[PDB]
Design a protein around this ligand. Sequence first.
Ligand code: HTL
Ligand code: HTL
Ligand code: HTL
Ligand code: CA
Ligand code: CA
Ligand code: CA
Ligand code: CA
Ligand code: CA
Ligand code: CA
Ligand code: CA
Ligand code: MG
Ligand code: MG
Ligand code: MG
Ligand code: NA
Ligand code: NA
Lengths: 566, 567, 267
Amino acid sequence: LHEIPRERPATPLLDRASSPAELRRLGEADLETLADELRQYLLYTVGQTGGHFGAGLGVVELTIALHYVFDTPDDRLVWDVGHQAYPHKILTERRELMGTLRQKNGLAAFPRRAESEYDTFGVGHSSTSISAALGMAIAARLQGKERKSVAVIGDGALTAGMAFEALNHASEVDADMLVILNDNDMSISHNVGGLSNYLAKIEELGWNYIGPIDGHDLPTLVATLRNMRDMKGPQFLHVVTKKGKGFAPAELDPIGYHAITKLGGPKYSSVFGQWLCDMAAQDARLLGITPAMKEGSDLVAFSERYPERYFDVAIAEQHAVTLAAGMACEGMKPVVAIYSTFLQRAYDQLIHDVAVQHLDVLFAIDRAGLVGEDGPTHAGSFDISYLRCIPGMLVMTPSDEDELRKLLTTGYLFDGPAAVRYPRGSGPNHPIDPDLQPVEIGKGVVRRRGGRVALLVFGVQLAEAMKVAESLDATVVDMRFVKPLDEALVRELAGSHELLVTIEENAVMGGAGSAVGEFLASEGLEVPLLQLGLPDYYVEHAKPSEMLAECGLDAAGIEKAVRQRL
Amino acid sequence: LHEIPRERPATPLLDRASSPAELRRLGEADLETLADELRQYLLYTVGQTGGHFGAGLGVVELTIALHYVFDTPDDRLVWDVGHQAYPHKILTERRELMGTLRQKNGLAAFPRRAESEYDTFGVGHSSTSISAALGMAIAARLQGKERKSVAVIGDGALTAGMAFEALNHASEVDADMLVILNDNDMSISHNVGGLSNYLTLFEELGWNYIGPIDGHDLPTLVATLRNMRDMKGPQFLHVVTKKGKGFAPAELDPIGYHAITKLEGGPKYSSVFGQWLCDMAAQDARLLGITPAMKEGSDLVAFSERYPERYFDVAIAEQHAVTLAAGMACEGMKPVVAIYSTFLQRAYDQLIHDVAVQHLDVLFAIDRAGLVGEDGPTHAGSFDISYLRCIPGMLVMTPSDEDELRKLLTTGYLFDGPAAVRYPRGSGPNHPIDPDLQPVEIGKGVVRRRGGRVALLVFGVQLAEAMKVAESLDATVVDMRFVKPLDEALVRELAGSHELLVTIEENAVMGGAGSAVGEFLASEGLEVPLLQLGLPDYYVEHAKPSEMLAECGLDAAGIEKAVRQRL
Amino acid sequence: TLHEIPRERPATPLLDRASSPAELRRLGEADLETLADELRQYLLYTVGQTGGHFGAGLGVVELTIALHYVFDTPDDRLVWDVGHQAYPHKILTERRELMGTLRQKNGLAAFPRRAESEYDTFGVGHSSTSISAALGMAIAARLQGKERKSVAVIGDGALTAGMAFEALNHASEVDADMLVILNDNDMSISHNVGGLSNYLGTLFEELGWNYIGPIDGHDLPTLVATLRNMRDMKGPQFLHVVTKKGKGFAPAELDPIGYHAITKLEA
Ligand SMILES: CC(=O)c1sc(CCOP(=O)(O)OP(=O)(O)O)c(C)[n+]1Cc1cnc(C)nc1N
Ligand SMILES: CC(=O)c1sc(CCOP(=O)(O)OP(=O)(O)O)c(C)[n+]1Cc1cnc(C)nc1N
Ligand SMILES: CC(=O)c1sc(CCOP(=O)(O)OP(=O)(O)O)c(C)[n+]1Cc1cnc(C)nc1N
Ligand SMILES: [Ca+2]
Ligand SMILES: [Ca+2]
Ligand SMILES: [Ca+2]
Ligand SMILES: [Ca+2]
Ligand SMILES: [Ca+2]
Ligand SMILES: [Ca+2]
Ligand SMILES: [Ca+2]
Ligand SMILES: [Mg+2]
Ligand SMILES: [Mg+2]
Ligand SMILES: [Mg+2]
Ligand code: NA
Ligand code: NA
């Protein structure tokens, strides 16, 4: 196909395969026709709602063959990451709900146990499928159940150390389970690493290896899976698919068609990428590291201009950070670009390898806060809380594009570990100073001098706080730093106002507001304190504006909370 | 050798090899005599100070060969974990300082950059060597330097996922570095895993594989290392050693001689956990026990022997341990993940994303919570209250003694969802232990003393010290039991009836349990003075556990001074 | 503990020469734990072949060995209540190699049966008859001057029946020399629901019995030593033993209701 259908296509066979049991009533001869119907229904629905695209097209045939051969849901199927599971959802009683995908109160971006009995494991982060399938298999064997356990993992997800740990342990316990490698020679960008090179060529770690087989040959898939369903012990099936199969533009541009949109101001990631290039042009020591997120974190231009100083480590957050630590030992200046939600997988390397040694590493933490449709598996809700308790960390929260550039510079030049957090999307579109100069560490900026109540803002809610301050005539501080905190300013405001209000796009528990509270307590300052931030639950996916409103982090919610406290 | 020398042995050659430069002036025919003298000194000094034992004996020859062939410190040598690096320190200008090993203001337990230019990377946690060495190699090439990069990694450390990530990336960048696999077929316990069975995969990943060679044949070591030193690209040398080599008692008992105490109470909290795990497993066939290669430390020994079909050592793979538990819980089994606070840092994402987000029924038994003593800051359990209590769904508990640990383990286990119970290394006040297996009410503290003006809210094992302070001051003391959910009702009552609330925890004050109390007081508009006592915002230098606690003010003397200074 | 039912005869060198109690009693005590393992293996295999009751027999593997080891069967009278847990008993009383005929036409019966073996003292099936039966044998033996022991093994479920209460009270009255062993696993077929289960030894002593226990029913050293002591004691004796239904087969330990009985395995 060359165009996405704008009208609900005619899919008669698909309508008779609304569940795996119904699918298993059809004949093998019908399956090739079912793959075409599903493929064009998939194209139609993702065009109506936007979402992940190319990966799911590559597993249309594998998904049909899997539910046709295995006794789902009793047999356990685990999809790694889950961004390729739209065909799965379509064949597990959610076809007619795909119109709600990634919308408020609609289907989630990824498989979710609470969403369907056909989803064995909630995924989003990568490389968890083998571990989860192994735990299921170990349980089923002790329980005496005959159910099968199958994990479908892509070549990109297989680059994570946690997959290596699972493969080794599964061999050790002689688990009866099937690992299906979905090898399309791609991640989001092209795959990197020695593992990818080996996979282009052609298992000794205790796995019975079968393949490679054509992942779009349904007759072959069905026959191979049938043979391996009943084989005992760790089984490894190597399948080859083409990302975007069946849609020519995606087959040609698999990076651009990894995800699509349905039917001003630079993105913060783009402000970072420009700062990265500008600083690299002035300082040969700068090295840029990403764990397989060149496009999202936006190291595109940097990777092209400075290929010798750009490092894609695959989906290996752990190694990215310890690698940077080693680079810093030689006097180089590494910058680790990493989403807040993925940095929690490198927490030990940040603490033990960087912070304990006070090494000069800059962490550019994108997707800080609520990320919208991708939902809670990807929310950057905790990085202020889990970083600010670590000795040696300089923790910064820019409030707009200009502040991001300046605080990146400040943390980069700081001789020690530094973190700069910023959200998905674009900002208030304020002018950006082209110079590359730092700001004083541990000093906030008073954006508005008023009275009675003072709003201490850590990050991008500053614009909303300024609106609230218009009606209440409040003081507004752009705090800039969580750690070290501008204690002198906090002390002054605590003595001159009747209420301090902290605002952050991070869990209230342990967050920036609590750093202010810790300081007030240590000095015996008794001013009332209202802490605004993310609540202690997982916010259901929706538009970012809807999630912020639910959490009370828009002007309306902030004003309501302040007035009620007053 | 058969006995540890009690008097300093005569080592005329070792005395002439106080640094690598001096060592390299010696002749090859001298190195095997030096190896003998080093082994004797090592036995002597570790006998004097206590410390890690068997692993270092295994690398005596490897260490000599490495510093003899490579141009250290210009060439970069990275030891994985570093518990096997005493010979390294003996040969790098620290032999006569080994008498201070693991003592306050003395040499650290592991290599440490601030301690010596010969220590390229501070280690303690495992499996970081390849990543660090690759970063130095990359930097050196970009800088136009011609230095070598070497990483020595044991077969146990190689089971971690981050070592796999590093091997994969090094091939991609075609870095000039040497990885030496120190294979003795052991971890702390026996190395169990699919990789130990295998021990080519290294060849297929882009590495030039040489070996296996005799890690105790100095002539072969020097010749082989010399050959690969100037080879280009990723090089991988497979070496075979014996843990405890040259000391028969250690060769015969490698577990017990992994570490020794210097030559010449109640149960350890780990032992209380081990007994609880066996007792609960006897009553519930669904319980499964998981450890990442720490059967001895967390004390799953009896459990592993009695319930071998429900015990799982995943090797040094903290990440897999947690997600594996998540999968088990999906099928209705009841996994208990035994993990040190410092090592749970490496599985944070799996706890959040695979367990907490799904509210799966997994119990985390968090040992070595707080200051751990001589192992120093790399192993401190300083942060688990802070990094867990911010996670929605987590039940976070802090027992104050042995009976409380048993009760809260039962409480966390019976709770249907993610639960964490944290406790320190060592033993406790030795209070009576109720043999029953009964939970306590969730989110409720216990008032242990009723006093007047100060209320001490204790989260964990400082309770006994706080009781001493409260008897001196006639103060109120609360055994909080739970960080999350907090006993808000009790905190509210004490905030109205006392002039000062004092929170005490063996965790970072920043983000800690005291800050949970602060968050509550602020949200309710309660403005009672609050004094937060806990671990400071720096890395506490190694010493005896009591000396480190005294430094942090978490003994009775420090607590009382802090309280009275506030008042 | 196993996870799979053996599909082929396991090697059981010790069991094979413990074909009868007299032969079992010639083995040393240090070999009984290994025999327990082999018996359990064979039980899993043969019941996988024929069908049959399952979990209850797994729970009394060790009890059965100790009973035939300490008591002089078949001269000493052993009575199994219900009898669905008596496959180990049959395996040790000259019927191991006949278990392949279990519950088939012209093969071994589902329960102990006097006509089937001199080692079966009482045909059972309905529950709670063992105390009554053993007491009748004890009274008769005393009257005919024959010094023999009388033992009833009854489960906690079977003990809820009124007739077990009648028998306990009469035995105390006549001061009979007999041993009642309560096989307590907190199960009937379903979970054991009732007042007696909640109580589970004051009740038994008030009724006139010498109560001992609770002891671990899978600790052979303890079982043998305890049974030897009570064998040398007279009058109404009551031993409280605690077992795990399905012991040694993890699927059964996890689903005791569903593994009360199984159907023949199919390939
Ligand atoms: C959207 C998202 O979260 C994806 S999808 C994807 C590529 C995985 O490639 P794979 O070969 O496994 O699948 P394929 O698309 O079929 O080729 C990445 C890196 N990510 C981001 C990411 C980064 N890091 C981690 C630990 N997890 C995730 N999910
Ligand atoms: C004491 C400590 O920190 C050691 S030493 C060791 C195994 C050493 O095995 P290896 O084969 O690498 O070396 P060997 O002793 O010479 O055989 C472990 C698991 N630990 C604890 C541990 C647990 N988990 C992690 C991530 N790091 C460490 N250091
Ligand atoms: C299958 C059959 O006939 C069994 S087994 C059993 C309970 C077994 O519990 P017990 O504690 O005595 O032994 P255990 O299995 O070892 O726990 C019952 C009620 N039944 C049915 C039944 C019902 N009612 C009567 C009078 N007799 C019998 N046998
Ligand atoms: Ca796109
Ligand atoms: Ca600005
Ligand atoms: Ca300027
Ligand atoms: Ca905004
Ligand atoms: Ca539980
Ligand atoms: Ca302590
Ligand atoms: Ca008093
Ligand atoms: Mg791929
Ligand atoms: Mg080893
Ligand atoms: Mg019963
Ligand atoms: Na020892
Ligand atoms: Na059944």
